[PDB]
Write a protein that binds this ligand. Structure first.
Ligand SMILES: *[C@@H]1O[C@H](CO)[C@@H](O)[C@H](O[C@@H]2O[C@H](CO)[C@@H](O)[C@H](O)[C@H]2NC(C)=O)[C@H]1NC(C)=O
Ligand SMILES: *[C@@H]1O[C@H](CO)[C@@H](O[C@@H]2O[C@H](CO)[C@@H](O)[C@H](O)[C@H]2NC(C)=O)[C@H](O)[C@H]1NC(C)=O
Ligand SMILES: *[C@@H]1O[C@H](CO)[C@@H](O[C@@H]2O[C@H](CO)[C@@H](O)[C@H](O)[C@H]2NC(C)=O)[C@H](O)[C@H]1NC(C)=O
Ligand SMILES: *[C@@H]1O[C@H](CO)[C@@H](O[C@@H]2O[C@H](CO)[C@@H](O)[C@H](O)[C@H]2NC(C)=O)[C@H](O)[C@H]1NC(C)=O
Ligand code: NAG
Ligand code: CA
Ligand code: CA
Lengths: 71, 5, 141, 71, 6, 71
């Protein structure tokens, strides 16, 4: 989402992920966003995806955590 | 409501 | 900070430094100061009056602007407070607030600011409009 | 580990930090307001007097962005 | 809520 | 609010989420009271800057009409 309310162009195409994503933070150096995924209300993952595009897909950094509401 | 996800 | 943005201003010996009021000539050039109810000009050349009546709700009724102050007055139903800006109703009668929920007119006693609620009338089915007549002390709906 | 603000918070879902001015922002889901303060929590103030069920919060430039779960 | 009181 | 000729139009609450669907309105001294059909409440605020907001009461049904009884 652009900061301009009058700009309707999406900064990047929507990225699909497994489960339900919750909390986000961006890494400037590698252009990657770390995000938590909540699954079956009992388990969770921390995954990242590259914003360099080039057909990049999300991959998991850590699993078997649980509900995780902050990064 | 409920303060979950 | 030695080459301050406020430097190379003449000392107050330069005919009060052109300030229209009390004057200061500190380490940062010079500074003009104004009494209460006044403000500095954009170029700090002269003091300028605050139009205290141009800010809404500064004075509750009939604000009047003076050269360096303000004058206020309120309608014969109101009495001015210690501060020359606020007035309250002169009556011993407190306000009551009346509202129309579907089944019931609700009256609120704003007495001792406690907000004590009670019904006005029992037989009501769907009230929409509300007003009152002070001459006969009746509530219309 | 010390508490910064601990008086009247219920459901502080959101928290943000502005490096430019070193103020701390947070949002309450139940109180439905967004508050600012110094890092020490002294100059506490209310920024938004009704923010509904805010979850996330982020400050960039001159604006604070927050997601609302209710609307 | 639609504006029409009815 | 505005003059009898519509001049000097001014805002006492604007760009505030606390209004959802206000219906009717009342003044007394320096307070304004209004009924909200969305929140089903009657509110109180300072009639010049909207700044000192509170709920007067919660209604089961939509509160439609309001008036202040006073000479
Ligand atoms: C919301 O996200 C969940 C978790 O990833 C996802 O399951 C929902 O999409 C659909 O849910 C159906 C029931 O679980 C399932 O039958 C369907 O295959 C699934 N679709 C995909 C693409 O996985 C998401 N729902 C919505 C409304 O966004
Ligand atoms: C609602 O407002 C009326 C008017 O102020 C109150 O009636 C008077 O209350 C005082 C203090 O209790 C008494 O001295 C008077 O005798 C009352 N009037 C009558 C006719 O008796 C009324 O009490 C208020 N309601 C509440 C609960 O505060
Ligand atoms: C809320 O936080 C304040 C600190 O900001 C707590 O105040 C301290 O409480 C301890 C005892 O637990 C005292 O020894 C300190 O002197 C207090 N500090 C100050 C500056 O007053 C307060 O106890 C906390 N309250 C709750 C409910 O946790
Ligand atoms: C709400 O009521 C408060 C007091 O309960 C008023 O607070 C003062 O308002 C001025 C003008 O905006 C501020 O500069 C002061 O710093 C406030 N004083 C204190 C002790 O906080 C206030 O005017 C009312 N309205 C608003 C907009 O908050
Ligand atoms: C004072 O300066 C500001 C900034 O340049 C300008 O916007 C404003 O209109 C000026 N006011 C007056 C009274 O000259
Ligand atoms: Ca004046
Ligand atoms: Ca609306």
């Amino acid at each position: 989402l652009h900061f301009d309310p009058r700009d309707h162009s999406l900064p990047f195409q929507v990225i699909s992920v497994a489960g339900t994503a919750i909390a986000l933070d961006y890494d400037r150096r590698n252009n990657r966003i770390f995000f938590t995924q909540k699954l079956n209300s009992l388990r969770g993952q921390i995954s990242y995806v590259s914003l360099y595009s080039g057909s990049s897909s999300p991959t998991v950094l850590l699993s078997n955590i649980g509900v995780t509401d902050g990064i | 409501x409920x303060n979950x996800x | 900070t030695d080459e301050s943005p406020l430097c190379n201003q003449d000392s107050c010996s330069h005919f009060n430094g052109g300030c229209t009021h009390q004057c200061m000539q500190g380490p940062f050039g010079a500074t003009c100061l104004c009494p209460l109810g006044y403000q500095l000009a954009n170029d700090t050349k002269t003091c300028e009056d605050i139009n205290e009546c141009d800010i809404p709700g500064f004075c509750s009724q009939h604000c009047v602007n003076m050269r360096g102050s303000f004058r206020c007055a309120c309608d014969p139903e109101y009495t001015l407070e210690s501060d020359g800006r606020t007035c309250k109703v002169t009556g011993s009668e407190n306000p009551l607030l009346v509202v129309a929920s579907r089944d019931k007119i609700i009256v609120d006693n704003i007495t001792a600011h406690t907000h004590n609620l009670y019904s006005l009338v029992q037989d009501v089915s769907f009230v929409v409009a509300l007003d009152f007549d002070s001459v006969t002390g009746r509530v219309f709906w | 580990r010390v508490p910064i603000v601990n008086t009247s918070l219920v459901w502080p879902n959101g928290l943000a930090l502005d490096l430019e001015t070193d103020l701390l922002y947070w949002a309450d889901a139940s109180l439905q307001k967004i508050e600012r303060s110094t890092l020490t929590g002294t100059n506490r103030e209310v920024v938004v007097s009704t923010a509904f069920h805010s979850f996330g919060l982020t400050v960039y430039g001159q604006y604070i962005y927050w997601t609302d779960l209710y609307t | 809520x639609x504006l029409x009181x009815x | 609010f505005c003059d009898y000729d519509g001049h000097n139009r001014r805002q006492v609450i604007a760009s505030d989420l606390v209004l959802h669907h206000p219906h009717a309105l009342t003044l007394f001294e320096d307070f304004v009271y209004w009924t909200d059909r969305g929140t089903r409440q009657v509110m109180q605020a300072n009639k010049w800057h909207g700044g000192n907001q509170s709920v007067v009461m919660y209604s089961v049904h939509q509160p439609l009409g309001i008036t202040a009884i006073h000479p």
